[PDB]
Amino acid sequence: QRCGEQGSGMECPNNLCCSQYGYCGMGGDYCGKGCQNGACWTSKRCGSQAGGKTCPNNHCCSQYGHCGFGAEYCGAGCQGGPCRADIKCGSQAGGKLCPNNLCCSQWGYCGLGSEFCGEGCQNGACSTDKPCGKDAGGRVCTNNYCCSKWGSCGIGPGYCGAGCQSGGCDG
Amino acid sequence: QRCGEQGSGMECPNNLCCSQYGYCGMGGDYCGKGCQNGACWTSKRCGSQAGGKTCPNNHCCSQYGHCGFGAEYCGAGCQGGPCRADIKCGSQAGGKLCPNNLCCSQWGYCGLGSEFCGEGCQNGACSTDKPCGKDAGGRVCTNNYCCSKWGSCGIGPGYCGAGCQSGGCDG
Numbered sequence: 001q002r003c004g005e006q007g008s009g010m011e012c013p014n015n016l017c018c019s020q021y022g023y024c025g026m027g028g029d030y031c032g033k034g035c036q037n038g039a040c041w042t043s044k045r046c047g048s049q050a051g052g053k054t055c056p057n058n059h060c061c062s063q064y065g066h067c068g069f070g071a072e073y074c075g076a077g078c079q080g081g082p083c084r085a086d087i088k089c090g091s092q093a094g095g096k097l098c099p100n101n102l103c104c105s106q107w108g109y110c111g112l113g114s115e116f117c118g119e120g121c122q123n124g125a126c127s128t129d130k131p132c133g134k135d136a137g138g139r140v141c142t143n144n145y146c147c148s149k150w151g152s153c154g155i156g157p158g159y160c161g162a163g164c165q166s167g168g169c170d171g
Numbered sequence: 172q173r174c175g176e177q178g179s180g181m182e183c184p185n186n187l188c189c190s191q192y193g194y195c196g197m198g199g200d201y202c203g204k205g206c207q208n209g210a211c212w213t214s215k216r217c218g219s220q221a222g223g224k225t226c227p228n229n230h231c232c233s234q235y236g237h238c239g240f241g242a243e244y245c246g247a248g249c250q251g252g253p254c255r256a257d258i259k260c261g262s263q264a265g266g267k268l269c270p271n272n273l274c275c276s277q278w279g280y281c282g283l284g285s286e287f288c289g290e291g292c293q294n295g296a297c298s299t300d301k302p303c304g305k306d307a308g309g310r311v312c313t314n315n316y317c318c319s320k321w322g323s324c325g326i327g328p329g330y331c332g333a334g335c336q337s338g339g340c341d342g
C-alpha cells in the first residue's frame with residue numbers, strides 16, 4: 001500500500017501526494033519536500049529541461065518543464081501528458097510511439113479507449129492481442145514489450161522472464 | 172507495490188494495468204478481466220452514466236461515460252478529467268470545488284501548479300497553507316480536509332486523528 005519508490009513508482013489516487021517516506025496523503029507533510037508524485041507543491045520537472053523525464057499521474061508537462069494541469073500546462077506549449085492538442089504517432093509520424101503506453105490509433109493520434117486501442121491500433125496499450133513469435137511469422141511486439149512463451153505481448157513476470165521469446169526479457 | 176483493492180486505490184505508473192489480483196503490468200493477463208485501473212481493455216464508466224465516479228489515472232470521462240484519453244474523451248462532452256476546456260470553480264461558479272483535488276485559482280478555474288495552487292487558491296491542493304480552527308478565527312478547511320492540532324489543513328493520520336478540530340477527523 002506504499003507509494004513513491006517504497007511501492008516501486010506507484011501513485012496515490014485522486015491526486016494525493018506521496019511523501020518522501022512512501023505514504024499517500026495531502027498536507028504540507030505529504031506535498032512539501034520529499035513529495036514524490038501527486039499534487040506536489042513544487043511541481044516535478046520533465047521534458048527537454050529534464051532530459052526527457054515524463055510527468056507522473058498523467059500531468060501535462062508545460063512548455064517550461066513543470067508538471068500540472070489547466071490552460072498553462074495542457075494548453076499550447078505542452079510537452080507531454082494529456083495535452084490539449086492531438087499527438088501524432090505511427091507511420092504518419094515516422095514510427096513515433098505514443099508516450100505513457102497510450103495507444104496509437106488507426107488514424108495516428110495517441111489516446112486510450114476502443115477508438116485508439118482496438119482495431120487498427122499500431123503501438124502502445126493495444127486491446128487487440130496480436131500474436132508474436134515463431135507461431136506468428138516471427139513477429140516481435142510494439143513498445144519493446146515482452147513476447148510471452150505462449151505468444152502474446154505484455155509486461156510482468158509471465159511475459160518477461162522464463163519463456164519470453166523476443167522483447168524486454170530479463171532471461 | 173500493490174494496487175486496486177490490494178493497494179488502497181494505489182495506481183500503477185505510466186498507465187500500467189492493475190489486474191484483479193492487485194498487480195501491475197501490461198498484457199492480456201493484467202489488462203483484461205479484473206483490470207482495476209490503468210489502460211484497461213475494458214474501459215470504465217464515469218460521470219452521469221456512473222453515479223459520478225471519476226476516472227482513475229486522470230483519464231477524461233467522455234460524454235458517453237467511458238474513461239480514456241483522446242479527442243473523443245477529453246474533447247467535447249468531457250464530463251471530468253483533464254478536459255480540453257477550462258473547468259470554472261470557486262466564488263464565481265456558485266462556490267463549486269474542483270474534481271480530484273484540483274486547485275481552484277483566484278480567477279475561478281481548475282488546474283494544478285503555482286498558477287493555481289499558489290496565491291489566490293480557493294479550494295483543493297492549495298499550497299497557501301493557511302491555518303484553521305481555534306488557532307485563528309475558527310475558520311475551517313476546503314474539501315472537508317482535516318484540520319490538525321497546530322491548525323494545518325490536510326488528510327492522513329496526523330490531521331484526522333486526535334487534535335483534529337474540523338474536517339474528516341478520522342477520530
Ligand SMILES: CC(=O)N[C@H]1[C@H](OC[C@H]2O[C@@H](O)[C@H](O)[C@@H](O)[C@H]2O)O[C@H](CO)[C@@H](O)[C@@H]1O
Pocket residue numbers: 043062063064065066068072073284285286
Ligand atoms: C506553466 C509553467 O511551467 N509554469 C511554471 C513557471 O514557468 C515560468 C513561466 O510562467 C508563466 O506563467 C509565464 O507566463 C512565463 O513567462 C514564465 O515566467 O515557473 C515556476 C517556477 O519558476 C513554476 O512553479 C510554474 O509551474
Ligand SMILES: CC(=O)N[C@H]1[C@H](OC[C@H]2O[C@@H](O)[C@H](O)[C@@H](O)[C@H]2O)O[C@H](CO)[C@@H](O)[C@@H]1O
Pocket residue numbers: 113114214233234235236237238243244
Ligand atoms: C468515447 C466513448 O465513450 N466511447 C465508448 C463507446 O461510446 C461510443 C459512442 O459512439 C457514438 O458515435 C454513438 O453515437 C454512441 O452510441 C456510442 O456508441 O461505448 C463503448 C461501449 O458502449 C465503449 O467501449 C467506448 O469507450
